[PDB]
């Protein structure tokens, strides 16, 4: 059994994306924890875990289709030096995923590979949830003000 | 058994008020949860469930009296785009209920329909609490300030 | 994030459908209860809830896509006056959904909005099951005889 | 270890009969459930499961005697389009089994193959009971009325 | 309700394939058990059971669509006389499913029958997993050598 | 058994450091509790108990080394009069320990007293987490604002 | 609190090795599982998780020291093509760490940063155990024969 080659590139592309996200998300969570925004950092941590799970799932798909999963390649990280830049950085990678996946699923279906399209379909839904979560944080930051918003990310007492 | 025509019409009018309220309140909970005010959102969602229950209770009374429950007619929604706006809109519908129900109760008793009256008295009591809750929130927004009040409506961390 | 306008219009159209179904299904259930078809009534009730859930799900999708959910609009109720009439009425609405959704889905995918599409796919599947049930019920009335079918809808003793 | 050729041919014959039955019985059960006769459908389903076991049992025995089990061959399905037709079709396959097994056992015993004869005797006891159930159901259709009997086959409320 | 005649032929073809597989798989499990490869047989037996489930699922869909499930028609069995022959035989039936379904799902969507399409989309995923397992065992036979692989398919002690 | 003079001198210097800390931290905890900053106050108390254990472990090592633990000397306390002055005052002592134990740890390994050295290494590690926590608290006052950060140190409601 | 710039560069070097190892080890376990060597794959997975943990700890330390953990840089993966190539590759990376760390710790002690040294000493020790396991796996490959070794890496029955 061997996968369609355009599909495999697509998969590997997405995999590379997931790997970048695991790292960006994780380091952001540690940085959030270090700044003392512990309550937020757990959320951000969970996001990295979610991305890690996505990476494993793609990996299995690639392998079943007899491909080589690219563990070498890494994307470019945007590492935020503020909470606001951090959410912004995270937003950008998820948008990059949507931009790649929306066309990609259609291609997968045109290639008669429903299983792959289905996996990509799930990822897209998850990323949408994430983006929605991230944009709402920026919305809140303005509505509450930045300092007030930020106080909601610490614990009582902080750290 | 058959209801007094006037009472059934008052009951139907109240039903339309409930159906209106269920929607306005439910949508507002969805909106507040979506802007990330989740903790407030749970409260609003309950108040909507409360209206669902009233509506069912009015429906039962109507049917008992050989009436036709009107599920077709709906009131004019006031959808707010800030928390304040939302609170004020909900207040408005509650006030219309008191305006309708207060004479309506005195009429039910003249017609000798105590059971419909007691039902309506119960709704009045419930709407008075809601108004007290809403009116208070509005008070707090001023006392605390709007942003600070809003902050108390999000979890830690937010959403 | 922003939804394709057509997709959002589709979703809203479905919402309007759901809101009409909740009311028509609820009303029917209350009436079946009122006639003493308590057993049947509980199933119909459950159907109304399924719709209430479809309404919430669609409402979430719309908010996610920065759409404006329409809780103002409701459709034309078909309130049956016999079980057979109710069954036909309910069927008619379900068929309206299938007629809308089937092309709707194709469109969602062209527009590359899989998440919405999947949301609609589940709904279609759900409505197909509902139509099968109601159509079976009519077959049963014919096969059993109407009165004998109706007896299967009362508790022992009745109500 | 090597079986008698006549015996083995008899077992493969009975195996073909089972395979047929499993298909007929299962479909009929699926058919009764779709009609809304969920209560009868459960029993018929059980009857098919019973036939699955007999085919496994005969399958072991043939294998133990160094035989080739025939899973390629299927007999003529009789699919009923009414409950009465279904009960009759089911009875005919059952009587074909007794007709074959009764001389078939004496043959097994004559050939000095008791274990094989014992397995067949058990199938016969089992088929006799199924036949009694079926013939009784037809008597009940005449005793009760066909519609009234059919009403005994649905839940409350239906499906 | 009434489905597309093409969708119903595809579902019926697939039904034939499922019944063929249930049979080849089950016999193969029994042959492996007979040979003393008990640990392996249990796995094989599960696979035939998985196909029994797919057969039922297809059946429900066909009946929902007012179609007539074909339980009379069977495929051509390939019964293997070695473990290697069996894996290859089973692989051959799976590849065939993939051949049928890959175009058919595209077709099902074209005809706006998402529920039938999703169902087959699921069978594709399952068959893909089963192929992956089967291709792996054959690879394990070359890597380990056949006798050694075979050793891994028996209990301690055997049967 | 006899400790090296230089080492014992170092253990005693540290012991003095620990008693000073116990007092300074315990009083800061009590003052913070007085001020109504009860939630922070609990974390501070815990820091004091940590020091109390450190003193005891040093005392035993000194006793095991035939030394005379100094429970008569104390350093100067910096009692802070705001939350900010307390955090700076605590940090200042923390740094005074690191400055002493860094060269001290090297010296112990030189006189060949690994056990004493490791005891110190642990203290240093512990002391490091303490500094990072305090240095993070001061940043948060800047980031959140002093009034806001302080509101994260009280309970709901205050004390 | 600022770490020594040399120590920080070392921590970052090691982080780089850890990210490299996490990927290699994870891919290798995914590949082994794929080949059906399930039993070995689980251990290999556990190894990758260990480096995931190493990575996290080193990250805290750099953050504690006001450092910037490099999650951008990854090293050359050596992906193995047989169980043997896989063991030999993972070994090579492990040896690279002992090489880097042996002098780094000494350096850390000189710059007087024991807590960093201690973390590294703990990595050096775990790495030794890993090397000893892998070295032993190769040895058993010779003692048993590659085929026989491999047979102990699969379950009964395989995958
Ligand atoms: C790149 C830096 C990474 C960091 C800092 C990291 C960190 C962690 C940590 C600390 C855990 C908890 C596991 C345990 O307690 O043993 C974990 C879980 C896991 N990681 Fe990673 N990891 C990284 C990369 C990866 C990659 C590239 C993969 C590829 C799949 C991966 C796969 C997993 C999986 C499958 C889990 C368990 C998820 C679960 O518990 O549901 N990790 N990670
Ligand atoms: C947009 C309109 C509505 C929406 C979104 C909505 C949504 C919901 C939901 C999500 C539930 C919880 C269901 C569960 O148990 O999982 C519910 C409950 C209920 N609904 Fe509705 N519903 C709506 C309209 C109505 C209407 C018109 C009535 C008519 C009287 C009604 C009657 C009820 C009742 C009686 C409950 C049980 C309340 C409780 O105890 O929590 N609902 N609704
Ligand atoms: C080749 C002849 C077949 C044999 C020998 C066979 C055998 C069996 C056996 C032994 C069981 C377990 C029975 C029990 O619990 O009492 C079973 C279960 C089942 N059978 Fe069959 N069967 C056959 C064909 C079929 C067919 C045609 C269908 C219908 C399409 C079917 C559907 C099922 C289902 C749905 C289960 C339960 C599945 C589960 O629990 O995982 N089987 N079969
Ligand atoms: C200078 C003022 C001090 C104050 C106000 C103080 C206060 C306290 C108090 C109230 C307890 C709880 C007692 C109990 O549970 O019965 C405690 C526990 C303890 N104290 Fe002190 N203490 C001081 C100094 C010290 C000193 C100098 C040492 C050792 C040299 C010390 C060692 C300990 C230890 C080891 C505990 C055990 C509680 C635990 O951590 O499990 N304390 N202290």
Curated annotation (Swiss-Prot), chains A, B, C, D, E, F, G:
User: What remark does the entry make about the cofactor?
Assistant: Binds 1 heme b (iron(II)-protoporphyrin IX) group per dimer.
Q: Which residues bind Fe cation 2?
A: 51, 94, 127, 130
Q: Which residues bind Fe cation 1?
A: 18, 51, 54, 127
Q: Which InterPro entries does its entry note?
A: Bacterioferritin, Ferritin-like, Ferritin-like_diiron, Ferritin-like_SF, Ferritin_DPS_dom
Q: Where is the Ferritin-like diiron domain?
A: 1-145
Q: Which UniProt keywords apply?
A: Heme, Iron, Iron storage, Metal-binding, Oxidoreductase
Q: What's the domain of life for this entry?
A: Bacteria
Q: List the disulfide bonds.
A: none
Q: What class of enzyme is it?
A: oxidoreductase
Q: Which molecular-function annotation in GO is an example for this chain? A: ferric iron binding
**Gene3D superfamilies attached to this UniProt entry:** 1.20.1260.10
Annotated positions binding heme b:
52
Q: What is its EC number?
A: 1.16.3.1
Query: What are the required cofactors?
Result: heme b
CC annotations in GO: cytosol
Its UniProt entry gives the catalysed reaction(s) as: 4 Fe(2+) + O2 + 4 H(+) = 4 Fe(3+) + 2 H2O; Fe(2+)(in) = Fe(2+)(out)
GO BP annotations, alphabetical order: intracellular iron ion homeostasis; iron ion transport
Q: Which Pfam families match?
A: Ferritin
What PANTHER family does this protein map onto? BACTERIOFERRITIN
Task: Describe the function of this protein.
Answer: Iron-storage protein, whose ferroxidase center binds Fe(2+), oxidizes it using dioxygen to Fe(3+), and participates in the subsequent Fe(3+) oxide mineral core formation within the central cavity of the BFR protein shell.
Q: Which family does it belong to?
A: Belongs to the bacterioferritin family.
Description of how the protein assembles with itself and partners: Homooligomer of 24 subunits, arranged as 12 dimers, that are packed together to form an approximately spherical molecule with a central cavity, in which large amounts of iron can be deposited.
Q: What is this protein called?
A: Bacterioferritin
> What gene is this protein translated from?
bfr
């Amino acid at each position: 059994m061997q996968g369609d080659p355009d599909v495999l590139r697509l998969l590997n592309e997405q995999l590379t994306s997931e790997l970048t996200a695991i790292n960006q998300y994780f380091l952001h969570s540690k940085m959030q924890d270090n700044w003392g925004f512990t309550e937020l950092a757990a959320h951000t941590r969970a996001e990295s875990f979610d991305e890690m799970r996505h990476a494993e799932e793609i990996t299995d798909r690639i392998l079943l289709l007899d491909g080589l999963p690219n563990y070498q390649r890494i994307g470019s990280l945007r590492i935020g030096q503020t909470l606001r830049e951090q959410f912004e950085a995270d937003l950008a990678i998820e948008y990059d995923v949507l931009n790649r996946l929306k066309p990609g699923i259609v291609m997968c279906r045109e290639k008669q590979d429903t299983t792959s399209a289905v996996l990509l379909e799930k990822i897209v839904a998850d990323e949408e949830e994430h983006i929605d979560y991230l944009e709402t944080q920026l919305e809140l930051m303005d509505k509450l003000g930045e300092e007030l918003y930020s106080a909601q990310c610490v614990s009582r007492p902080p750290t």
